[PDB]
Write a protein that binds this ligand. Structure first.
Ligand SMILES: [K+]
Ligand SMILES: [K+]
Ligand SMILES: [K+]
Ligand SMILES: [Mg+2]
Ligand SMILES: [Mg+2]
Ligand SMILES: [Mg+2]
Ligand SMILES: [Mg+2]
Ligand SMILES: [Mg+2]
Ligand SMILES: [Mg+2]
Ligand SMILES: [Mg+2]
Ligand SMILES: [Mg+2]
Ligand SMILES: [Mg+2]
Ligand SMILES: [Mg+2]
Ligand SMILES: [Mg+2]
Ligand SMILES: [Mg+2]
Ligand SMILES: [Mg+2]
Ligand SMILES: [Mg+2]
Ligand SMILES: [Mg+2]
Ligand SMILES: [Mg+2]
Ligand SMILES: [Mg+2]
Ligand SMILES: [Mg+2]
Ligand SMILES: [Mg+2]
Ligand SMILES: [Mg+2]
Ligand SMILES: [Mg+2]
Ligand SMILES: [Mg+2]
Ligand SMILES: [Mg+2]
Ligand SMILES: [Mg+2]
Ligand SMILES: [Mg+2]
Ligand SMILES: [Mg+2]
Ligand SMILES: [Mg+2]
Ligand SMILES: [Mg+2]
Ligand SMILES: [Mg+2]
Ligand SMILES: [Mg+2]
Ligand SMILES: [Mg+2]
Ligand SMILES: [Mg+2]
Ligand SMILES: [Mg+2]
Ligand SMILES: [Mg+2]
Ligand SMILES: [Mg+2]
Ligand SMILES: [Mg+2]
Ligand SMILES: [Mg+2]
Ligand SMILES: [Mg+2]
Ligand SMILES: [Mg+2]
Ligand SMILES: [Mg+2]
Ligand SMILES: [Mg+2]
Ligand SMILES: [Mg+2]
Ligand SMILES: [Mg+2]
Ligand SMILES: [Mg+2]
Ligand SMILES: [Mg+2]
Ligand SMILES: [Mg+2]
Ligand SMILES: [Mg+2]
Ligand SMILES: [Mg+2]
Ligand SMILES: [Mg+2]
Ligand SMILES: [Mg+2]
Ligand SMILES: [Mg+2]
Ligand SMILES: [Mg+2]
Ligand SMILES: [Mg+2]
Ligand SMILES: [Mg+2]
Lengths: 93, 271, 46
RNA sequence: AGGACCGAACCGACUAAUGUUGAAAAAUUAGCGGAUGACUUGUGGCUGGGGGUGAAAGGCCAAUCAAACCGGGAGAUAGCU
RNA sequence: GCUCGCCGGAAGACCAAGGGUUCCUGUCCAACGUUAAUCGGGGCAGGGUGAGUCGACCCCUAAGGCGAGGCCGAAAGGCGUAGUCGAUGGGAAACAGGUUAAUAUUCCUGUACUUGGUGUUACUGCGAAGGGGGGACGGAGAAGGCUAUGUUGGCCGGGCGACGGUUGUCCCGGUUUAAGCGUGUAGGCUGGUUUUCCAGGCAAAUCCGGAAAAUCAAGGCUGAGGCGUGAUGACGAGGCACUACGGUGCUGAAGCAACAAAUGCCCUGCUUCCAGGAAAAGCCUCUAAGCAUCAGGUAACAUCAAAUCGUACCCCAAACCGACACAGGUGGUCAGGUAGAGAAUACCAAGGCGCUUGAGAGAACUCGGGUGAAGGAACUAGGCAAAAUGGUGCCGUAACUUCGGGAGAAGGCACGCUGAUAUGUAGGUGAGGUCCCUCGCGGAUGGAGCUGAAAUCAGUCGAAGAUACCAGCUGGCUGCAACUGUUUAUUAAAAACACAGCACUGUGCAAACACGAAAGUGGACGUAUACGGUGUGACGCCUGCCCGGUGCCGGAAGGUUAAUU
C-alpha cells in the first residue's frame, strides 16, 4: 500500500495547454505536472485518492528544462515529469 | 596425393597442393572442439614478442589425446580428419565403452583399423606402449619425455623416432633432428610414423597463401635504417658486418643452447 | 578530410571519465590537482 | 577455379590545369589504379616515448616526430645578437 | 500564384553515432545572416517528446578489463585464480488504419501476441553450482520455387478538348488492404519404434554415447510463398459543403486478371573447396543431495503485473568532425518509369531544391569550353596538354611462350525504320476441360489467353542508324622488377619494400628467442615435415678459386692469467 503522505506529494499541478484541453475533451485524459521520481502506480493511486476519480491508465514522460539567458547569463530550467492520466469514461475531472 | 595447379593465373602457376580424399569432408566432432583465439605474437604485456604472426583463418582447437591413457580397451578408427592446428592429420577413434577421442593419425591408419594402448598391446601402428615393451629398433612417434606427461617428440607430419638401445631404466632414441637422447623406459610411444608425410611437398605458390596461415611479412634487417636494426644503413646496398639478430646476437653459427639441467640426457647433439 | 576529433561518448567516458581517473593513483592525483586549482568541472563526465 | 579479366558502389592517388591572403592548413575538375582479396568497412579492445608500431619511407604514434604532448628541475647555459 | 530551371543509387526518404531544443506557434529586426530582409537554425515568450511488444535497462557471453585469496616486486606497484564486468554478437512479445501546429508500431479505433505472480480444478515424481542436447556459426558457386515491385488488359469514375483531327484499336485517374489465426505447400534433412546389455559422459541417470536382437517400413523435424480468415471493416478516384483561403466536415465507385520480376525470401539450405570456419545463456532433457499422499511439475481456466530511462528536431548535414551558414569527411537501411548488361549513363516520377549580394556592360588579360583554311610533332626536356580510339554479333589474327597465354593482337563486315516469313516465329508462362488418385496447396494429358528474342528476304529516309549520354588508340625495339600487392598522411609509387621459392644457421621443449628487477606471458595448448634469426628473391641454365685478415665452430697439451689463499 502506498502511503497517503507519499500520495499527497506526487501531484504538483494541472498542466494547462491546448494539447491538454484537447486531451481532456477528446479522450478523457487529464495532464498533470508530477514529481520527477513519481511512478505510474503512485500517480494512479494519488489521482484516485485525492481526486476521487477512477483511473484507466497513466502515461508519463520527462520534459527537459530549457537553457535560457537572463541578462545574458546562462542558466537551465529544471526537468519535470508530465502525466497523461486517462480516466474511466464517466469520471468528470 | 600431390597435384600441380595449372598456370591459369600467375598466383596459381607455382601452387602444389596435397589433396587427401580420405579426410572427412564435414564438420569435426563437436565435443572435442575448443575455441583458440589468436595472439598476433603479443604477450600479456601487449607487446609483440614473436614477430611475423597475425591474421590468417579462424581455427577451432581439437582436443587431441597425446597421453593415450585408456589402457586395455580397444578403439576403432571412425574417420581421419583435417586439423588446422598442426601438420599431422588426426583420427577420431571410438572406444568400446562408447568414448570418442582424437589421436594423431599415423602412416597407414584408416577407418576401421583397431588400436589399443597399454603394456598388453600388440606391436602394430597406432598402438601405444611404454617403451620398455617396444622392441629395440622400432619406429615410434608421439614419444613421452616423462612418464604420464603425454607425447611431445615426433608429432609433426611424417616424423618418427627410432629406439636405438635400451640400458636399464632408460632408452636411447634417435630423434628426427639427428640427436641422440635418453628418455625413461617407462615413457610411452606410439608405434609407427606420423602420417601426412607429403605435407612438406606442398608449394604455397603466392604471398596470400602464407598470409592465410597467419604469417606476416619478414622485413630484412639490411632493408632498414641503423636505428631499427644492426644491419640497417648504407648508401645503396651495403653490408660489411657480421650477421646478427635484431638484438645484436650473431646469427650464422653461434650456439644458444644453455641448459645444464638437461645436458645429462643428451648423448650426441644433432650434428 | 577526416579530422582528429571523432567523438564517442562511451570511449570518452572510459578514457577520461571520473571512474577511470579514480581507478589509479595517478588519476587520483589528477583529480587532486584539479580540485586544488578549483576547477568547476573535474572530469569529462560532467 | 582464380591474390583471373572488363567495369559502378567502395578503397586509392599516376598526369595535367586551377587554386596558393584557397571553397579547402593538401582540395576541385578532366583523365588514372585496385575492385572475392596480402580487399574494404562499422563498433569495441590492446601496444606509451629511447617506448610503441612499421610489406622499412626514419614512416606513423591527435594539423606536432632522427625521440610526442603537458607540468616540473627552470630565471638550464648563451665567450653570441 | 503561374511559368522556367536543377537533383532524383539523390541534392529524396528513414536511422545509428554525434549534437542538444536547433522542433511548432506568436512576436521582434539592434547584433548575428558575407547584401536588403517584412525572412531565419538570430532575439524574446509560450507550447511540444505519452510504449508490457521499439530501444536502453535486463539475462548471456567475445576481445579485453578488474580481480578475494595467491605468486612476484625497494615503495608505488606487476601478473593472475575463484569470480566479476565488458557488445560490435545470442536471448519473450503488435500490426493496419486515424489523429496534432508540433508525438506516435507510444494517443485513438479495430484486431493480436509474450512473460511472470498469485487463486481454483484436474493429472502427478519434483528436485542442480552437476551430465547430455541445442543454441552453433567459413569462402565460393549453381539452380529452382517465390515475394517486393513493375507493365498491360479488364473494371470503375470522369473527358470529347484554345489550332487540322479525336465516340475510339481515344484520353486522364483509381483499382489498396497488415500483424495475428487456420492450412504444412515448392522444397531441405533424417530411417522409425520396442526391449536387453555396457570399462564412457569426474557421482547418478530413465538423458547422451556404445553393443545386441525383434519389427515396421513411413514416422519425425524444418519450410518461403500461396489460399482462407482478419475485413458486411478500413481505405479509396472523385463529388458535395463550407472555409480565419492553412485546410477542414460529409459522401463514396471499381477495388480483378495475366505477364515480367529481384542483389530481397525459402537458404543457418544445396553443391563444392581449403585457408577448415566464436562463446555463454535462454530453451530441451537427465539424474544427485533432498523432499517425499507436502512442497513442487504438467495442464486448462480466472485474476493481477510488465517498473524505470529514451522518444521533439538535424543526421552525406547550415544542427555531427573540419575556428565559418566552410566545394572536404561521416556507418546502416529504402531502390519507381523509359532506354540500358547495369546501383553506369540520359531524361523523368515520388519527393526536394535554384546553392543569402544584385543590376548593367560586352575592352585587354585570366579561367572553363566550342569551331577552324593549308600544313600535321615542324612544338617541346618529353606529343605535356589536346585530338583520336571506344558498343554488340560474326569473320580473322604473327613472333614468342612457362602451353595458361600473347589476344579485344592486328584487321574487317553488319547495325535505323517498315512489311512479310509468322494477321506474333523459336521460346517462356499457363486457364478451362478431361483422365487417374496413396482424395489435396494431388498427379497425367490438354492446351485457350498472356508474353516473346533472334534471323531471313524485300522495301524505305538521311551526309551520317554502336547517331545523344556512354564507350580500348594501335604497333615495333629495348633497360629494370617474375607476377597480384606495399610505401615517404601533406613535393618521391619506383628499379625501393614485400612475395612464393632457395640457402645458411640456431633451437630436444621449462626450445631457441622476445617482453618483463620478478612472478609470469608470447613462441605454442605447437614439438625438428616445428619454431626463430639471417641473406637471396617466381621460373630456366647455373652459382667457379681463396680459411691469409675479421667472425663463428671445435680443441685442451703447453704459455699467460682474477677473486681467493
Ligand atoms: K641501405
Ligand atoms: K640510403
Ligand atoms: K622521448
Ligand atoms: Mg496505453
Ligand atoms: Mg515512456
Ligand atoms: Mg619469422
Ligand atoms: Mg622469407
Ligand atoms: Mg631506406
Ligand atoms: Mg646500431
Ligand atoms: Mg654501393
Ligand atoms: Mg665494400
Ligand atoms: Mg582481380
Ligand atoms: Mg596510402
Ligand atoms: Mg578525381
Ligand atoms: Mg589490371
Ligand atoms: Mg577493374
Ligand atoms: Mg634515408
Ligand atoms: Mg601527425
Ligand atoms: Mg633526446
Ligand atoms: Mg637548476
Ligand atoms: Mg633563459
Ligand atoms: Mg535557442
Ligand atoms: Mg523552424
Ligand atoms: Mg535595418
Ligand atoms: Mg545585414
Ligand atoms: Mg529561432
Ligand atoms: Mg575474460
Ligand atoms: Mg590483474
Ligand atoms: Mg590482493
Ligand atoms: Mg555479465
Ligand atoms: Mg549489441
Ligand atoms: Mg515530425
Ligand atoms: Mg507479385
Ligand atoms: Mg551482390
Ligand atoms: Mg522523431
Ligand atoms: Mg551559403
Ligand atoms: Mg558542408
Ligand atoms: Mg562513404
Ligand atoms: Mg547517376
Ligand atoms: Mg568574354
Ligand atoms: Mg581560352
Ligand atoms: Mg576544335
Ligand atoms: Mg586546322
Ligand atoms: Mg582541314
Ligand atoms: Mg597526317
Ligand atoms: Mg623536334
Ligand atoms: Mg625546336
Ligand atoms: Mg596525355
Ligand atoms: Mg579528349
Ligand atoms: Mg640502356
Ligand atoms: Mg614489381
Ligand atoms: Mg601493382
Ligand atoms: Mg608525399
Ligand atoms: Mg605522388
Ligand atoms: Mg613457456
Ligand atoms: Mg634483393
Ligand atoms: Mg636480383
Amino acid at each position: 500500500m502506498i502511503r497517503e503522505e507519499r500520495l499527497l506529494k506526487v501531484l504538483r499541478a494541472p498542466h494547462v495547454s491546448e494539447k491538454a484541453s484537447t486531451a481532456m475533451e477528446k479522450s478523457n485524459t487529464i495532464v498533470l505536472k508530477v514529481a520527477k521520481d513519481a511512478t505510474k502506480a503512485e500517480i494512479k493511486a494519488a489521482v484516485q485518492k485525492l481526486f476521487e476519480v477512477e483511473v484507466e491508465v497513466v502515461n508519463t514522460l520527462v520534459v527537459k528544462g530549457k537553457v535560457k539567458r537572463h541578462g545574458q547569463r546562462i542558466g537551465r530550467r529544471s526537468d519535470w515529469k508530465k502525466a497523461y492520466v486517462t480516466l474511466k469514461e464517466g469520471q468528470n475531472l | 596425393a600431390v597435384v600441380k595447379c595449372k598456370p591459369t593465373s600467375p598466383g596459381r602457376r607455382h601452387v602444389v597442393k596435397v589433396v587427401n580424399p580420405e579426410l572427412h569432408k564435414g564438420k569435426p566432432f563437436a565435443p572435442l572442439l575448443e575455441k583458440n583465439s589468436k595472439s598476433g605474437g603479443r604477450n600479456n604485456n601487449g607487446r609483440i614478442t614473436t614477430r611475423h604472426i597475425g591474421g590468417g583463418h579462424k581455427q577451432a582447437y581439437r582436443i587431441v589425446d597425446f597421453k593415450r591413457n585408456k589402457d586395455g580397451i580397444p578403439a576403432v578408427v571412425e574417420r581421419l580428419e583435417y586439423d588446422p592446428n598442426r601438420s599431422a592429420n588426426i583420427a577420431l577413434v571410438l572406444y568400446k565403452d562408447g568414448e570418442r577421442r582424437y589421436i594423431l593419425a599415423p602412416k597407414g591408419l584408416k577407418a576401421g583399423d583397431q588400436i589399443q594402448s597399454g603394456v598388453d598391446a600388440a606391436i602394430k601402428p597406432g598402438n601405444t606402449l611404454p617403451m620398455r615393451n617396444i622392441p629395440v629398433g622400432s619406429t615410434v612417434h608421439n614419444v613421452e619425455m616423462k612418464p604420464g606427461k603425454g607425447g611431445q617428440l615426433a608429432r609433426s607430419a611424417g616424423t618418427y623416432v627410432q629406439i636405438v638401445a635400451r640400458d636399464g631404466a632408460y632408452v636411447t632414441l634417435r630423434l628426427r633432428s639427428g640427436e641422440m637422447r635418453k628418455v625413461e623406459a617407462d615413457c610411452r610411444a606410439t608405434l609407427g610414423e606420423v602420417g601426412n608425410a607429403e605435407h612438406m611437398l606442398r608449394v604455397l605458390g603466392k604471398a596470400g597463401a602464407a598470409r592465410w596461415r597467419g604469417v606476416r611479412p619478414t622485413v630484412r634487417g639490411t632493408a632498414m635504417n641503423p636505428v631499427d636494426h644492426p644491419h640497417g644503413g648504407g648508401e645503396g646496398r651495403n653490408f660489411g658486418k657480421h650477421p646478427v639478430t635484431p638484438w645484436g646476437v650473431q646469427t650464422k653459427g653461434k650456439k644458444t643452447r644453455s641448459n645444464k639441467r638437461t645436458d645429462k640426457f643428451i648423448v650426441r647433439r644433432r650434428s | 578530410m577526416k579530422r582528429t576529433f571523432q567523438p564517442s561518448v562511451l570511449k570518452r567516458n572510459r578514457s577520461h571519465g571520473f571512474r577511470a581517473r579514480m581507478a589509479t593513483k595517478n588519476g587520483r592525483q589528477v583529480l587532486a590537482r584539479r580540485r586544488a586549482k578549483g576547477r568547476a568541472r573535474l572530469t569529462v563526465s560532467k
